[PDB]
Design a protein around this ligand. Structure first.
Ligand SMILES: [Mg+2]
Ligand SMILES: [Mg+2]
Ligand SMILES: [Mg+2]
Ligand SMILES: [Mg+2]
Ligand SMILES: [Mg+2]
Ligand SMILES: [Mg+2]
Ligand SMILES: [Mg+2]
Ligand SMILES: [Mg+2]
Ligand SMILES: [Mg+2]
Ligand SMILES: [Mg+2]
Ligand SMILES: [Mg+2]
Ligand SMILES: [Zn+2]
Lengths: 97, 217, 87, 25, 121, 206, 81, 129, 96
RNA sequence: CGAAGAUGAUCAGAUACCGUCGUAGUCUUAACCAUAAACUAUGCCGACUAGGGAUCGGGUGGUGUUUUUUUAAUGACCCACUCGGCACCUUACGAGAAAUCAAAGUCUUUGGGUUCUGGGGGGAGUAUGGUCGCAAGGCUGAAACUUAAAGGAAUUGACGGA
């Protein structure tokens, strides 16, 4: 039976968007379905800031950041515990926590 | 002599409410079954189906026993209630209890020229429980109960003498068929015929008028 | 209903909803009957003497039995300027 | 028997049955 | 490991309900008068009942304990609750009324004092 | 039916216009635009307090029509009405329920909170919904202190009042007990104020 | 609302409807007696006028067509109907 | 599209009779709508209905009081003889003692009981009870 | 309008559509194609005499387990080969 | 990048996953094909029935911000409406077997108009015949025979290298 109203994706009015590649296993997956997380890490680690801080010219310099949009497939985002299958009443929630 | 709780039942053991038609008129929830025993003493019960439903456990099968029981006097009141119990004593005896609390009247009528003593119903009414749909149709005299013997017994105990039956869905599902029949005989009073178009004084309940020999502090 | 020889035979005339004219029937346990006491000079109870309305379960459950009673009590005089006909 | 995989078995037999009539003609 | 069963806590709560102007914050007299006012089949059972009941009173002397009702707190708790403030709330200190609040009072036709202040948007 | 003396006295309006009872919600339910008067900037909706009184007098006419005064059950789960419901309960007959309602009260005749009111008054139809829903099973009319954003399903009588402040809730409960006692043999004259002050219905901290 | 008066609705509740969905549909547009700054002569311009209307003297524009009402030419006095 | 405006009249009535309304609005006001509404009026099923003469085709506001359970169209307008009115009314109407099946007839748009008295017949429009 | 055309002049489109969808029944497709006489060894009849060739013992289907004691019969009227059950306790000794 | 194919490991076996290559293909031009879980498994048109807020595009009105610099264009934003759309949320009057659905409602109280399709499961989208295509195949499309269940939705358990 129809498990989700929005079937697995975000497509009510297209028929077709474009596919994207899963960054784990290179599965071709539609972009509206895929699963998207934004990873904004600091460049080094939080643990290694003070070592790079003392051993640097340019005091309080920038500590830059690494941004990358990650598209997963459903098989790879479940296995990497990103979406973590919910209950029948819970899965209707559309807020991040 | 049963210590009535529930104010309406306190008036009924008193003798202040003599008719169940006054309960029906103000739509009062009968929660105590001795209200029905005293007001409708000539009441007969027929136990029909004792089907055992079963529940799967880690091991074994626990076969509880359902019951459908129709109570009714053949002057225009029946009830119907389902009792799934561990034993068929508690299925039958408490099934008669739940049958009595649901007792509702039927608006008998005429196919008819209006020569005396209503023999039939006054309206084609339907009732839908599950896939089952039951239509009851007014019928001329001597028609008998043209119904399946499940729906025939519910209408015999409601005192209908002449009625036609359409059916749909799984009438072999016995619970839904009588439940859909019960909605059909229940909607006989819900149907606004032209002789009910007269504006009525909208009276005062016994629980307002007799508010001191009820509500025993 | 009556038979041929007079004899109003019914077994019971049901009440009506005062707002939507439906039959209030023996299982409508969402249906109410409100008694509103008439009031004598300078504001007492007149015990026993009511301005009585009945609402079926449908007009309540639709959320309209508020404004049903607003209209039903305004024309009886009980309310003065709460309900306006031209909505 | 996935019905798609029964199909490509059948489409194989669709060719062979119209081969054996062209064989005899 | 010292959580008490419902049969200790019901019987303790049933003692507080009908024997508050009796047994006090001492365990030893609570132990001894549960011999007369209750029929308890064991000495070990009686002492657990008498001890939680003793624990209950020590809680009652600082505030009521929910799940327990008797009159000795009931006419106490209303006597805290009859207090009226003489701060004259719902009396005018000097009545803040907006423009579309002044239009309402005018359209009721009544006599009120107001103070007209615009709303910042 | 109400001669001239049941008009909103301007001394009652100083109570209602200073307890912030006129400030309604930001979202008006379609069953409540009767009660709305001329929306203010920053979305403030002004309830007509004249229509508040006439519903309140009508409510008291319903309350002073049940011959036992005790089976007028009054409900308040929210704390802002919790003092006010008990002060309503002491002055009139008025079997109170303050705080949690314990479902199975109107039905479920074997319970220890088993009641059969002939009338229920609630403070918020949102929070007291278990009382309002269970009133729909045993034919009980419901009066309700309603804001403009509140569900009117199975609410027969709706007193349009602000439910955000504490003074607005407490005032309406005070005047509701008042007109019941005024419209029977308990507070005989209609023209003097009650010496029972409005602020004994009001919530306090701590 | 279960009882209302569709025959005589509120006139504010009539201006808050589409020009078709009212009780008697009709135009919400109008005509304007427009004067140029150059002279005194009188033209009649529709609301949603779809046309760069030119007068006798200032024969360039008096209103510019837009997607709705025509915007008048910023020096021209108008008067309704 | 809009083929039978009688259905556009008689579905706006049932949809608001069911929801307890004391009024409907009917668009677009045929004569057949009016002379259906007049038969429903004269037998006790609606109240006053008022026709709004706009300059196109008419709106109609009907005051529905409370007495109506079902009104509807039998589409297409079947040729009804005089010996099948007792088969047409026996299928649409709940009991014999009340309810009316509305015919079209060259003697006029009319219900079935007096069409049996007038000994006339014709096409069928619908029913009311 | 629930599928079908309702109109007065649409009696043909309903009648064509009925015959079209009438073929999906089991008896109408059998009776109108005449498979009783063409196929079906008893060519539309109820009883047919035949000549006994053989006595077969057919295994009964699982979960039953018995030998069913039929015979093999060539029909006199048609020459077709059929298997015929011999129903009672015994009675295979009665045939030949 | 990669049907095929070559090759490297493991597995008891691998004519498979995985690693490295790699023809056809993937791109295009000019012609064929005509199928997709071609899906919203929901024909198209029309009417009515219930509240909400957000967005898109269009329009109307603010002596509203924005350029607060004397009686401060235009865009953008804010607020209220209505027109149309993609959706959604809440309830469930109704509907259904339920999952759910303001449509899948206005349906035994069965008739707004109209097109196509289905008739227990297989055999079988098979045979044959016609037709279309360079072909792969497409469209139309059986019967004999066999079968007492197949299936749908939800419940409880059980089990999951969840
Ligand atoms: Mg699944
Ligand atoms: Mg697609
Ligand atoms: Mg068709
Ligand atoms: Mg390609
Ligand atoms: Mg296809
Ligand atoms: Mg399809
Ligand atoms: Mg299509
Ligand atoms: Mg829209
Ligand atoms: Mg088949
Ligand atoms: Mg085909
Ligand atoms: Mg072929
Ligand atoms: Zn000029």
């Amino acid at each position: 039976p129809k498990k989700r109203a929005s079937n697995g994706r975000n497509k009510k009015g297209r028929g077709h968007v474009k596919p994207v590649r899963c960054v784990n296993c290179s599965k071709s997956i539609p972009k509206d379905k895929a699963i998207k997380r934004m990873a904004i890490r600091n460049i080094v680690e939080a643990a290694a800031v003070r070592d790079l801080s003392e051993a640097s010219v340019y005091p309080e310099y920038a500590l830059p950041k690494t941004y990358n949009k990650l598209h997963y497939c459903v098989s790879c985002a479940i296995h990497a515990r990103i979406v973590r299958v919910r209950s029948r009443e819970d899965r209707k929630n559309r807020a991040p926590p | 002599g049963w210590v009535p709780v529930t104010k309406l039942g306190r008036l009924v053991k008193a003798g202040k409410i003599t008719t169940i038609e006054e309960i029906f008129l103000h739509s009062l929830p009968v929660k105590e079954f001795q209200i029905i025993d005293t007001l409708l003493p000539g009441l007969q019960d027929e136990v029909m189906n004792i089907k055992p439903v079963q529940k799967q456990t880690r091991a074994g099968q626990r076969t509880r026993f359902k019951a459908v029981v129709v109570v009714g006097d053949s002057n225009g009141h029946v009830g119907l209630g389902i009792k799934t119990a561990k034993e068929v004593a508690g299925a039958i005896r408490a099934g008669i209890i739940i049958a009595k609390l649901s007792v509702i009247p039927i608006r008998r009528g005429y196919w008819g020229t209006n020569l005396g003593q209503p023999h039939s119903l006054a309206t084609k009414t339907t009732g839908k429980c599950g896939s089952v749909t039951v239509r009851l149709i007014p019928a001329p005299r001597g028609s008998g109960i043209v119904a399946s013997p499940a729906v025939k017994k519910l209408l015999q105990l409601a005192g209908v003498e002449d009625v036609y039956t359409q059916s749909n869905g799984k009438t072999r599902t016995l619970e839904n068929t009588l439940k859909a029949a019960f909605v059909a005989i229940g909607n006989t009073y819900g149907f606004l015929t032209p002789n009910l178009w007269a504006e009525q004084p909208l009276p005062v309940s016994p629980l307002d008028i007799y508010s001191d020999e009820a509500s025993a502090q | 209903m009556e038979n041929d020889k007079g004899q109003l035979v019914e077994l019971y005339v049901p009440r009506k909803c005062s707002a939507t004219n439906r039959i209030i029937k023996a299982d409508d346990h969402a249906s109410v009957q409100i008694n509103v006491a008439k009031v004598d000079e300078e504001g007492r109870a007149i015990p026993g003497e009511y301005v009585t309305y009945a609402l079926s379960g449908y007009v309540r459950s639709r959320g309209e039995s508020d404004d049903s009673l607003n209209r039903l009590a305004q024309n009886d005089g009980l309310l003065k300027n709460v309900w306006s006909y031209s909505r | 028997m996935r019905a798609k995989w029964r199909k490509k078995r059948t489409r194989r037999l669709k060719r062979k049955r119209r081969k054996v009539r062209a064989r005899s003609k | 490991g010292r959580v008490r069963t419902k049969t200790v806590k019901r019987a303790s709560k049933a003692l507080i309900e009908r024997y508050y102007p009796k047994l006090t914050l001492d365990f030893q007299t609570n132990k001894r008068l549960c011999d007369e006012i209750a029929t308890i089949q064991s000495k070990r059972l009686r002492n657990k009942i008498a001890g939680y009941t003793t624990h209950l009173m020590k809680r009652i002397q600082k505030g009521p304990v929910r799940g327990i009702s008797f009159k000795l707190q009931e006419e106490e708790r209303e006597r805290k609750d009859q207090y009226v403030p003489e701060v004259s709330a719902l009396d005018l200190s000097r009545l803040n009324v907006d423009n579309q609040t002044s239009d309402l009072v005018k359209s009721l036709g009544l006599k009120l004092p107001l103070s007209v202040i615009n709303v910042s948007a | 039916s109400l001669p001239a003396t049941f008009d909103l006295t301007p001394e009652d309006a100083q109570l209602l216009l200073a307890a912030n009872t006129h400030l309604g919600a930001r979202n008006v339910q379609v069953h409540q635009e009767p009660y709305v008067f001329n929306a203010r900037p920053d979305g403030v909706h002004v309830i007509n307090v004249g229509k508040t009184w006439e519903k309140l007098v009508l409510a008291a006419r319903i309350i002073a029509a049940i011959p036992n005064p005790e089976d007028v059950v009054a409900i308040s789960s929210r704390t802002f009405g919790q003092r006010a419901v008990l002060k309503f309960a002491a002055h009139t007959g008025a079997t109170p329920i303050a705080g949690r309602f314990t479902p199975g009260s109107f039905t479920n005749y074997i319970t220890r909170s088993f009641k059969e009111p002939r009338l229920v008054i609630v403070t918020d139809p949102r929070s007291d919904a278990q009382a309002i829903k269970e009133a729909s099973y045993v034919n009980i009319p419901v009066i309700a202190l309603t804001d403009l954003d509140s569900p009117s399903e199975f609410v027969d009588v709706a007193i349009p009042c602000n439910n955000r402040g504490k003074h607005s809730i407490g005032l309406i409960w005070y005047l509701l007990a008042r007109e019941v006692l005024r419209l029977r043999g308990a507070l005989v004259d209609r023209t003097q104020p009650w010496s029972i002050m409005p602020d004994l219905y009001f919530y306090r901290d701590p | 609302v279960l009882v209302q008066d569709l025959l005589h609705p509120t006139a504010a509740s009539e201006a808050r409807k589409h020009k078709l969905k009212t009780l008697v549909q009709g135009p919400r547009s109008y005509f304007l007696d427009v004067k140029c700054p150059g002279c005194l002569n009188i033209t009649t311009v529709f609301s949603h006028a779809q046309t760069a209307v030119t007068c006798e003297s200032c024969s360039t524009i008096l209103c510019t067509p837009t997607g709705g009402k025509a915007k008048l030419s910023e020096g021209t006095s108008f008067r309704r109907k | 599209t809009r083929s039978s405006v009688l259905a556009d009249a008689l579905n706006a009535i049932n949809n608001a009779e069911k929801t307890g309304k004391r009024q409907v609005l009917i668009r677009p006001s045929s004569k057949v709508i009016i002379k259906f509404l007049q038969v429903m009026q004269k037998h006790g099923y609606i109240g006053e209905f008022e026709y709004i003469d706009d300059h196109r085709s008419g709106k109609i506001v009907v005051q529905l009081n409370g007495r109506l359970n079902k009104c509807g169209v039998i589409s297409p307008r079947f040729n009804v003889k005089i010996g099948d009115i007792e088969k047409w009314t026996a299928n649409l109407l709940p009991a014999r003692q009340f309810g009316y099946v509305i015919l079209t007839t060259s003697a006029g748009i009319m219900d079935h009981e007096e069409a049996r008295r007038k000994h006339v017949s014709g096409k069928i429009l619908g029913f009311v009870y | 309008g629930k599928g079908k055309p309702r109109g007065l002049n649409s009696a043909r489109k309903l009648r064509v559509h009925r015959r079209n969808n009438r073929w999906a029944e089991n008896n109408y497709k059998k009776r109108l194609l005449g498979t009783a006489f063409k196929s079906s060894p008893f060519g539309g009849s109820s009883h047919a005499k035949g000549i006994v060739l053989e006595k077969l013992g057919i295994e009964s289907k699982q979960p039953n387990s018995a030998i069913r004691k039929c015979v093999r019969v060539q029909l006199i009227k048609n020459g077709k080969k059929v298997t015929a059950f011999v129903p009672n306790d015994g009675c295979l000794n009665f045939v030949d």
